[PDB]
Amino acid sequence: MAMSGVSVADECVTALNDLRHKKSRYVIMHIVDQKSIAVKTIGERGANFDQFIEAIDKNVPCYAAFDFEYTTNDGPRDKLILISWNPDSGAPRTKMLYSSSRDALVPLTQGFQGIQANDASGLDFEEISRKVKSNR
């Protein structure tokens, strides 16, 4: 409920929109100029750890969406998860920007479990599978 300037760019909306249809795999975007959100590094199936870490930066507020199929309904099911980066021990502007963008990300990421977790706590594959498997 900050509302300052941070807003999701058209490019981001299109990237996530297509990603939801299993266009690649996952998409990672970050906030630029704390006003306009831009893409930093897009996935496809399983980017390298070197490039993944090199691109990602544990500090600024970033959002990564991953599309994974499951058999919760019966078989041919698809569920996308949204993980936000924002360590409590990070920065003040970073934690604030998260809320300023969360409002605009709410409508953008409709139907996706959005959770904020920093460090391994945010990249916990087990947490993602457990969340989607539970559907809560």
PDB file of C-alpha atoms in Angstrom:
ATOM      1  CA  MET A   1       0.000   0.000   0.000  1.00  0.00           C
ATOM      2  CA  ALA A   2       2.941   2.303  -0.723  1.00  0.00           C
ATOM      3  CA  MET A   3       2.209   3.503  -4.257  1.00  0.00           C
ATOM      4  CA  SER A   4       5.195   5.613  -5.306  1.00  0.00           C
ATOM      5  CA  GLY A   5       6.083   4.754  -8.891  1.00  0.00           C
ATOM      6  CA  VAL A   6       7.174   1.126  -9.149  1.00  0.00           C
ATOM      7  CA  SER A   7       4.979  -0.506 -11.791  1.00  0.00           C
ATOM      8  CA  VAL A   8       5.097  -3.647 -13.933  1.00  0.00           C
ATOM      9  CA  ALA A   9       6.089  -2.848 -17.515  1.00  0.00           C
ATOM     10  CA  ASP A  10       4.233  -4.274 -20.512  1.00  0.00           C
ATOM     11  CA  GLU A  11       7.226  -6.500 -21.258  1.00  0.00           C
ATOM     12  CA  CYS A  12       6.901  -8.095 -17.820  1.00  0.00           C
ATOM     13  CA  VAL A  13       3.161  -8.676 -18.204  1.00  0.00           C
ATOM     14  CA  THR A  14       3.744 -10.384 -21.551  1.00  0.00           C
ATOM     15  CA  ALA A  15       6.611 -12.506 -20.230  1.00  0.00           C
ATOM     16  CA  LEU A  16       4.569 -13.826 -17.304  1.00  0.00           C
ATOM     17  CA  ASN A  17       1.432 -14.129 -19.434  1.00  0.00           C
ATOM     18  CA  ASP A  18       3.187 -16.449 -21.884  1.00  0.00           C
ATOM     19  CA  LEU A  19       5.103 -18.234 -19.124  1.00  0.00           C
ATOM     20  CA  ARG A  20       1.777 -19.272 -17.598  1.00  0.00           C
ATOM     21  CA  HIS A  21       1.083 -21.137 -20.840  1.00  0.00           C
ATOM     22  CA  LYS A  22       4.327 -23.086 -20.464  1.00  0.00           C
ATOM     23  CA  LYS A  23       6.137 -20.935 -23.026  1.00  0.00           C
ATOM     24  CA  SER A  24       9.493 -21.723 -21.417  1.00  0.00           C
ATOM     25  CA  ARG A  25       9.697 -22.458 -17.691  1.00  0.00           C
ATOM     26  CA  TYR A  26      10.253 -19.512 -15.350  1.00  0.00           C
ATOM     27  CA  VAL A  27      10.800 -15.755 -15.585  1.00  0.00           C
ATOM     28  CA  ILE A  28      12.803 -13.553 -13.221  1.00  0.00           C
ATOM     29  CA  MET A  29      12.328  -9.779 -13.163  1.00  0.00           C
ATOM     30  CA  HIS A  30      13.595  -6.960 -10.943  1.00  0.00           C
ATOM     31  CA  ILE A  31      12.684  -3.355 -10.143  1.00  0.00           C
ATOM     32  CA  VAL A  32      14.490  -0.691 -12.167  1.00  0.00           C
ATOM     33  CA  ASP A  33      14.789   2.907 -10.971  1.00  0.00           C
ATOM     34  CA  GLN A  34      12.270   1.914  -8.300  1.00  0.00           C
ATOM     35  CA  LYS A  35       9.627   3.053 -10.787  1.00  0.00           C
ATOM     36  CA  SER A  36       9.631   0.680 -13.761  1.00  0.00           C
ATOM     37  CA  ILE A  37      10.052  -3.092 -13.532  1.00  0.00           C
ATOM     38  CA  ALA A  38      12.374  -4.688 -16.087  1.00  0.00           C
ATOM     39  CA  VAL A  39      13.523  -8.228 -16.874  1.00  0.00           C
ATOM     40  CA  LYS A  40      16.963  -9.272 -15.637  1.00  0.00           C
ATOM     41  CA  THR A  41      17.189 -12.903 -16.745  1.00  0.00           C
ATOM     42  CA  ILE A  42      14.626 -15.271 -18.255  1.00  0.00           C
ATOM     43  CA  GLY A  43      14.713 -19.046 -17.911  1.00  0.00           C
ATOM     44  CA  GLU A  44      13.576 -21.786 -20.280  1.00  0.00           C
ATOM     45  CA  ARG A  45      13.853 -25.131 -18.489  1.00  0.00           C
ATOM     46  CA  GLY A  46      16.868 -25.077 -16.189  1.00  0.00           C
ATOM     47  CA  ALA A  47      19.328 -22.196 -16.422  1.00  0.00           C
ATOM     48  CA  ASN A  48      22.875 -22.782 -15.180  1.00  0.00           C
ATOM     49  CA  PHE A  49      23.715 -22.146 -11.526  1.00  0.00           C
ATOM     50  CA  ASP A  50      26.568 -19.859 -12.572  1.00  0.00           C
ATOM     51  CA  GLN A  51      24.373 -17.686 -14.793  1.00  0.00           C
ATOM     52  CA  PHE A  52      21.397 -17.936 -12.437  1.00  0.00           C
ATOM     53  CA  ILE A  53      23.367 -16.689  -9.433  1.00  0.00           C
ATOM     54  CA  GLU A  54      25.399 -14.239 -11.515  1.00  0.00           C
ATOM     55  CA  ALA A  55      22.194 -12.577 -12.712  1.00  0.00           C
ATOM     56  CA  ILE A  56      20.217 -12.778  -9.471  1.00  0.00           C
ATOM     57  CA  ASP A  57      21.320 -10.480  -6.648  1.00  0.00           C
ATOM     58  CA  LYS A  58      20.335 -11.162  -3.038  1.00  0.00           C
ATOM     59  CA  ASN A  59      19.414  -7.611  -2.032  1.00  0.00           C
ATOM     60  CA  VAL A  60      17.048  -5.690  -4.309  1.00  0.00           C
ATOM     61  CA  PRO A  61      13.358  -6.670  -4.554  1.00  0.00           C
ATOM     62  CA  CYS A  62      12.887  -9.232  -7.324  1.00  0.00           C
ATOM     63  CA  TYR A  63      10.127 -11.626  -8.382  1.00  0.00           C
ATOM     64  CA  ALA A  64      10.543 -15.031 -10.022  1.00  0.00           C
ATOM     65  CA  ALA A  65       7.660 -17.092 -11.405  1.00  0.00           C
ATOM     66  CA  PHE A  66       7.992 -20.820 -12.084  1.00  0.00           C
ATOM     67  CA  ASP A  67       5.439 -22.921 -13.964  1.00  0.00           C
ATOM     68  CA  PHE A  68       5.119 -26.566 -12.924  1.00  0.00           C
ATOM     69  CA  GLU A  69       2.561 -29.176 -13.977  1.00  0.00           C
ATOM     70  CA  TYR A  70       0.959 -31.560 -11.484  1.00  0.00           C
ATOM     71  CA  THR A  71      -1.813 -34.137 -11.106  1.00  0.00           C
ATOM     72  CA  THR A  72      -3.848 -32.591  -8.290  1.00  0.00           C
ATOM     73  CA  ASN A  73      -7.096 -32.430 -10.261  1.00  0.00           C
ATOM     74  CA  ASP A  74      -6.500 -35.748 -12.023  1.00  0.00           C
ATOM     75  CA  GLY A  75      -3.510 -35.461 -14.338  1.00  0.00           C
ATOM     76  CA  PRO A  76      -3.189 -32.658 -16.913  1.00  0.00           C
ATOM     77  CA  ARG A  77      -2.924 -29.849 -14.363  1.00  0.00           C
ATOM     78  CA  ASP A  78      -0.756 -26.724 -14.317  1.00  0.00           C
ATOM     79  CA  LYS A  79       0.221 -24.512 -11.379  1.00  0.00           C
ATOM     80  CA  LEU A  80       2.466 -21.442 -11.310  1.00  0.00           C
ATOM     81  CA  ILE A  81       4.253 -20.160  -8.208  1.00  0.00           C
ATOM     82  CA  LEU A  82       5.598 -16.685  -7.448  1.00  0.00           C
ATOM     83  CA  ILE A  83       8.595 -16.140  -5.171  1.00  0.00           C
ATOM     84  CA  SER A  84       9.558 -12.635  -4.052  1.00  0.00           C
ATOM     85  CA  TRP A  85      13.053 -11.758  -2.835  1.00  0.00           C
ATOM     86  CA  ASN A  86      13.323  -9.436   0.166  1.00  0.00           C
ATOM     87  CA  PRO A  87      15.531 -10.348   3.155  1.00  0.00           C
ATOM     88  CA  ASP A  88      14.559  -8.724   6.455  1.00  0.00           C
ATOM     89  CA  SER A  89      18.274  -8.050   6.918  1.00  0.00           C
ATOM     90  CA  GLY A  90      18.596  -6.563   3.445  1.00  0.00           C
ATOM     91  CA  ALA A  91      17.718  -2.927   2.801  1.00  0.00           C
ATOM     92  CA  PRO A  92      14.886  -0.559   3.812  1.00  0.00           C
ATOM     93  CA  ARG A  93      14.017   0.598   0.295  1.00  0.00           C
ATOM     94  CA  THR A  94      14.103  -3.004  -0.925  1.00  0.00           C
ATOM     95  CA  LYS A  95      11.569  -4.159   1.665  1.00  0.00           C
ATOM     96  CA  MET A  96       9.394  -1.105   1.025  1.00  0.00           C
ATOM     97  CA  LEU A  97       9.519  -1.389  -2.766  1.00  0.00           C
ATOM     98  CA  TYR A  98       8.146  -4.908  -2.324  1.00  0.00           C
ATOM     99  CA  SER A  99       4.861  -3.529  -0.990  1.00  0.00           C
ATOM    100  CA  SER A 100       4.802  -0.690  -3.520  1.00  0.00           C
ATOM    101  CA  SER A 101       5.039  -3.274  -6.300  1.00  0.00           C
ATOM    102  CA  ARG A 102       3.013  -5.989  -4.574  1.00  0.00           C
ATOM    103  CA  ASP A 103      -0.150  -3.960  -5.162  1.00  0.00           C
ATOM    104  CA  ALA A 104       0.520  -3.856  -8.904  1.00  0.00           C
ATOM    105  CA  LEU A 105       1.730  -7.462  -8.873  1.00  0.00           C
ATOM    106  CA  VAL A 106      -1.443  -8.654  -7.146  1.00  0.00           C
ATOM    107  CA  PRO A 107      -3.609  -8.224 -10.271  1.00  0.00           C
ATOM    108  CA  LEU A 108      -0.770  -9.215 -12.602  1.00  0.00           C
ATOM    109  CA  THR A 109      -0.079 -12.498 -10.809  1.00  0.00           C
ATOM    110  CA  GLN A 110      -3.692 -13.637 -10.476  1.00  0.00           C
ATOM    111  CA  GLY A 111      -4.026 -17.307  -9.585  1.00  0.00           C
ATOM    112  CA  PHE A 112      -0.436 -17.712  -8.419  1.00  0.00           C
ATOM    113  CA  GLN A 113       0.789 -18.364  -4.877  1.00  0.00           C
ATOM    114  CA  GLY A 114       2.911 -15.326  -4.078  1.00  0.00           C
ATOM    115  CA  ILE A 115       5.253 -15.694  -1.114  1.00  0.00           C
ATOM    116  CA  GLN A 116       8.145 -13.513   0.046  1.00  0.00           C
ATOM    117  CA  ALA A 117      11.226 -15.444   1.160  1.00  0.00           C
ATOM    118  CA  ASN A 118      14.912 -14.507   1.150  1.00  0.00           C
ATOM    119  CA  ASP A 119      17.920 -16.824   0.916  1.00  0.00           C
ATOM    120  CA  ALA A 120      17.477 -20.571   0.437  1.00  0.00           C
ATOM    121  CA  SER A 121      14.140 -20.096   2.197  1.00  0.00           C
ATOM    122  CA  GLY A 122      12.912 -18.510  -1.021  1.00  0.00           C
ATOM    123  CA  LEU A 123      14.491 -21.033  -3.379  1.00  0.00           C
ATOM    124  CA  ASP A 124      13.292 -24.047  -1.393  1.00  0.00           C
ATOM    125  CA  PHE A 125      12.059 -26.413  -4.104  1.00  0.00           C
ATOM    126  CA  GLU A 126      10.431 -28.491  -1.365  1.00  0.00           C
ATOM    127  CA  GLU A 127       8.442 -25.446  -0.249  1.00  0.00           C
ATOM    128  CA  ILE A 128       7.212 -24.804  -3.790  1.00  0.00           C
ATOM    129  CA  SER A 129       6.137 -28.401  -4.400  1.00  0.00           C
ATOM    130  CA  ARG A 130       4.509 -28.571  -0.966  1.00  0.00           C
ATOM    131  CA  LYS A 131       2.646 -25.303  -1.538  1.00  0.00           C
ATOM    132  CA  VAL A 132       1.330 -26.289  -4.968  1.00  0.00           C
ATOM    133  CA  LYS A 133       0.615 -29.841  -3.811  1.00  0.00           C
ATOM    134  CA  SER A 134      -1.452 -28.485  -0.918  1.00  0.00           C
ATOM    135  CA  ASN A 135      -3.061 -25.696  -2.943  1.00  0.00           C
ATOM    136  CA  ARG A 136      -3.383 -23.262  -0.038  1.00  0.00           C
TER     137      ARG A 136
END
